[PDB]
Structures are given as C-alpha cells and as structure tokens.
C-alpha cells in the first residue's frame with residue numbers, strides 16, 4: 462500500500478518541452494536513464510520516505526584499500542541518501558582498521574570480516590567500489606528493482622568498441638552485433654532480491670568459466686554486462702554517477718559530477 466503524496470508546489474512539467482535535448486533519457490525498454498534535470502528530487506524524496514525506505518550500501522575494502530574508507534564514508538554522509546535510512550556494510554580483512562566516521566541520525570555501519578541478513582535489514586542494495594568519493598547528490602532517484610551505470614569511458618562509443626568478453630567459450634560472451642550499453646562494475650544495485658539474483662548468476666557463470674579454463678577479459682564486469690544484456694535494468698545511471706575527472710575532465714553533458722575516482 463502506497464499512501465498519497467501531500468500537496469506540493471513545483472514547476473509544471475511541460476509536455477512539449479523535452480527534458481534534455483542533448484542526451485537519451487529513456488532506454489528502448491522504457492527504463493529511465495538518470496541525468497540531472499530529469500527528476501524533481503522533492504517528489505521522489507516524498508515517495509520513498511512515505512515508504513520508510515532503507516538503503517544498504519556495500520563496499521569491499523581489502524588490504525591497502527582500507528585507506529580509502531574514511532573519505533568514502535565521510536563524503537557518503539554528505540551526499541548519499543541524506544534524509545533516508547542508510548545501512549553501510551563494510552566487508553574487510555582488517556576490521557580494526559575501519560575508521561571511526563561520525564554518522565547522521567538514522568544511519569548505521571556494520572563491519573563484516575572476510576546473506577539473508579540483507580533481506581530483513583534493507584529494501585535496496587547499492588554496490589560500489591571504495592576507492593571513490595561522493596562530490597554531489599546521489600539519492601533515491603537511482604532506486605529501482607535493478608540498475609546499472611554507464612561506464613564513463615564508453616557512454617559515447619558504438620557497441621563494437623565495447624570491451625565485452627568476445628570469446629564464445631566464455632559465459633560472458635557477447636557478439637559484435639549485440640549490446641545496449643557498457644556498464645561499469647563499480648556501481649550497480651536494486652532491490653535485495655534482484656541484486657542477489659544478479660550476484661548469484663554472476664558467481665555461477667564465473668565458476669563455469671573457471672572449470673572451462675577461461676577468465677573473462679574484465680572479470681566480474683564482463684559477467685555483469687552479460688547479465689544486464691539479458692535482464693534489462695529498470696533504470697540506468699548516467700556517467701554523472703561514476704566519473705574520473707582527472708582522466709576525462711568535465712564535459713558539458715555532465716551538469717554534475719556526483720561519484721568520482723580518487724586521484
């Protein structure tokens with residue numbers, strides 16, 4: 462049951478005025494492609510808050526990567542799902558090395574040393590790399606059953622240029638005439654159920670490749686792309702959500718740089 466929204470005052474959407482004229486804002490399977498200017502965050506915040514939405518954010522920090530946790534968590538506190546319930550899950554081999562980061566109310570962090578726990582604790586799972594930092598708003602506009610993010614190095618590339626696994630012997634194989642986008646494995650998510658279905662499929666496909674003596678060109682990312690090709694994501698995030706300013710600068714097509722690589 463979804464309760465009614467309250468009275469809200471905002472600019473009337475204009476049917477005869479395109480949102481963005483420089484980019485594709487919806488996929489051929491009618492999934493929104495999230496760019497700045499396509500959403501009214503006030504309306505979305507209302508919708509998700511009325512549902513008491515809890516977002517889980519998972520990150521793996523192994524070896525030297527534990528050094529990136531402080532900046533990652535501190536910036537997440539400033540830009541990630543602010544106003545909503547957030548549960549951070551830090552998977553690490555160095556529990557005592559996790560920094561003591563001050564969290565806002567309604568946000569918690571669990572350290573798992575390296576399940577069904579996710580199903581009873583959060584509504585959505587967001588899986589990202591730790592050697593990153595939030596620089597701008599990353600909110601409920603990304604929440605949906607299953608989402609992938611456009612890799613910043615291929616959003617303007619033709620499918621034949623995509624670095625998909627091209628060997629038929631691999632379960633992640635995608636021929637030159639197939640493919641919608643090249644998604645980056647550093648930022649994906651969705652409902653707990655869909656994320657677990659994805660990781661389960663990826664894990665099984667990789668086990669098969671291993672038994673066949675083959676390793677996908679870009680490992681898990683290759684399998685993620687194969688999965689999202691056959692199971693279309695319900696939302697696709699623009700490169701605003703996964704950028705590298707040092708390597709790619711700041712193109713006009715990006716009104717905001719929200720989540721970036723750490724120089």
Ligand SMILES: CC(=O)N[C@@H]1[C@@H](O)[C@H](O[C@@H]2O[C@H](CO)[C@H](O)[C@H](O)[C@H]2O)[C@@H](CO)O[C@@H]1O
Nearest residue numbers: 612613614615623624644645646679682708
């Ligand atoms: C323009 C260009 O080709 N730049 C490349 C980056 O794409 C590349 O980033 C890697 O990309 C692969 C997939 O092709 C994986 O996503 C990998 O995780 C990325 O690091 C970098 C690093 O190889 O090299 C150039 O910058």
Ligand SMILES: [Cl-]
Nearest residue numbers: 588589590647
């Ligand atoms: Cl991840």
Ligand SMILES: [Hg+2]
Nearest residue numbers: 480481498499
């Ligand atoms: Hg718009």
Ligand SMILES: [Hg+2]
Nearest residue numbers: 519586587588
């Ligand atoms: Hg995850």
Ligand SMILES: [Hg+2]
Nearest residue numbers: 663664667681
């Ligand atoms: Hg995997």
Ligand SMILES: [Hg+2]
Nearest residue numbers: 663681684685
């Ligand atoms: Hg995967």
